[PDB]
């Protein structure tokens, strides 16, 4: 801090959201970015795009991690993705609903979709705590015959990931191009596969979080996650109530 | 012609883009029954014993 206000912050505006970032990010891309071409072969109806709705960034979770519980490779986030982000809004019975959130409003009226994602993670420690986090993404990880051996952070160091150093307190951005076994994903439970299950997003604890022995120091720290879609195309307009959502299955 | 005749067509969407009869996604074009009919199939299968011969 040398100015009256601390310093010059940097701004990342998309649609009507604006995200301040004071540090140099840490970026990676889960595979090569491309322009979809065979997706026109799958559906005769025009694919609808909602750039004002879906391009917008969205706050997803806040996960709390404490000094007393940081192993090596303790999972803060282990989620089917985008399934967990899109179905984040639950009613009293924990049944998701695509109606409230304006990014997810088109998932309500369509059957199939396709889009690229960008997950961005934020940690705001003070200067005197030191740790380290890894956030990696595994394409259709849940369907893999050994999915539960790949959760060690030694395995995540290989799949596309970002690192968040808590001593430096940087941002991190993980771009995820759409890749899947079929040119679209289902938005609801139809034709009886889970909806919108493209992979698994992990957040592990690469180096455990450490603070000073002083009593008033923070023993905890927050992690926040923002997500946004990019080339989102929806197809197959139906009624909102023609299909149902059931409460999601969790990973082991 | 009455077999293919289509009166008062109401079509909600455009037609679907073509894969050239599968040649886009697989390597070959399955456009014809005469090519399917040239893959061999069983015709007659029997046994013959001595004593029901000559």
Interface check for B26 against chain A (CB to CB < 8 A): the answer is no
Sheet holding A197-210, edge to edge: A77-82, A197-210, A130-139, A161-165
Report resolution (Å) to 1 decimal.
Answer: 3.4
Task: Look at A44 and B16 and tell me if their CB atoms are within 8 Å.
Answer: yes
Q: How far is Cα A78 from Cα A222, in angstroms, rounded to an integer?
A: 16
Taking CB atoms and an 8 Å cut-off, how many pairs form between chains A and B? 16
CA dist list (Å): A109 to A15, A100, A112: 22, 13, 10
Which method was used?
Answer: cryo-EM
Interfacial A residues in 126-165 facing B (CB < 8 Å): none
Q: Scanning every residue of chain B, which has its alpha carbon at the shortest distance from the alpha carbon of A235? A: B13
* Domain extent listing, chain A: 1-252
Asked whether A86 and A107 are in contact (CB, 8 A), the reply is yes
Vertex B26 angle, CA A195 and B24, to 5°: 90
Interface check for B20 against chain A (CB to CB < 8 A): the answer is no
Asked whether A195 and A28 are in contact (CB, 8 A), the reply is no
Task: Look at B13 and A41 and tell me if their CB atoms are within 8 Å.
Answer: no
Q: How far is Cα A161 from Cα A137, in angstroms, rounded to an integer?
A: 7
Tokens 């009593």, located at residue = A215
Asked whether A134 and A157 are in contact (CB, 8 A), the reply is yes
**Element containing residue A54 per DSSP (H, E):** helix A51-54
Task: Look at A41 and B24 and tell me if their CB atoms are within 8 Å.
Answer: yes
Q: Does domain A1-252 have CATH number 2.60.120.20?
A: yes
Asked whether A198 and A178 are in contact (CB, 8 A), the reply is yes
Q: What is the dihedral of CA A11, A77, A206, A224, to 10 degrees?
A: 20
CA dist list (Å): B27 to B14, B18, B21: 26, 14, 10
Task: Look at B25 and A40 and tell me if their CB atoms are within 8 Å.
Answer: no
Pairing relationship of beta strands A172-176 and A27-29 according to DSSP bridges: parallel
Can you read off the two tokens belonging to residue A226? 């923002």
Q: What is the dihedral of CA A181, A184, A189, A190, to 10 degrees?
A: -100
Asked whether A231 and A115 are in contact (CB, 8 A), the reply is yes
Indicate the SS3 state at residue A38. helix
Q: How far is Cα A183 from Cα A185, in angstroms, rounded to an integer?
A: 7
Asked whether A203 and A161 are in contact (CB, 8 A), the reply is no
């Amino acid at each position: 801090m040398d100015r009256p206000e601390g310093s010059e912050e940097r701004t990342v505006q998309t649609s009507n959201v604006v995200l301040g970032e004071t540090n140099i990010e840490s970026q990676d891309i889960a595979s090569k970015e491309y322009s979809p071409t065979w997706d026109r072969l799958a559906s005769s109806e025009v694919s609808d795009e909602y750039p004002m709705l879906t391009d917008r960034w969205l706050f997803w979770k806040s996960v709390k991690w404490e000094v007393n519980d940081s192993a090596f490779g303790k999972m803060l986030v282990q989620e089917k993705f985008p399934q967990s982000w899109v179905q984040m809004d639950v009613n009293v019975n924990n049944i998701p609903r695509y109606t409230n959130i304006p990014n997810f409003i088109p998932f309500n009226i369509h059957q199939y979709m396709r889009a690229d994602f960008e997950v961005k993670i934020y940690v705001n420690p003070n200067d005197f705590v030191s740790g380290w986090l890894i956030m990696a993404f595994l394409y259709q990880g849940s369907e893999m015959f050994d999915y539960k051996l790949r959760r060690n952070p030694a395995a995540l160091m290989q799949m596309p990931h970002v690192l968040v150093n808590v001593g430096a307190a940087n941002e991190a951005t993980l771009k995820i191009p759409y890749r899947y076994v079929r040119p679209f994903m289902r938005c609801k439970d139809i034709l009886r596969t889970e909806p919108l299950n493209m992979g698994v997003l992990f957040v592990e604890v690469l180096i455990p979080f450490r603070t000073s022995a002083a009593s008033s120091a923070p023993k905890s720290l927050d992690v926040s996650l923002f997500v946004k879609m990019t080339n989102a195309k929806f197809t197959g307009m139906v009624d909102g109530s023609i299909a149902l959502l059931s409460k999601p299955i969790a990973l082991p | 012609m009455e077999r293919t005749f289509t009166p008062n067509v109401m079509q909600p969407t455009p037609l679907l883009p073509t894969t050239n009869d599968g040649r886009v996604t697989f390597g070959e074009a399955f456009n014809d029954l005469k090519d399917l009919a040239r893959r061999y199939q069983l015709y007659w299968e029997g046994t013959i014993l001595e004593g029901n011969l000559r």
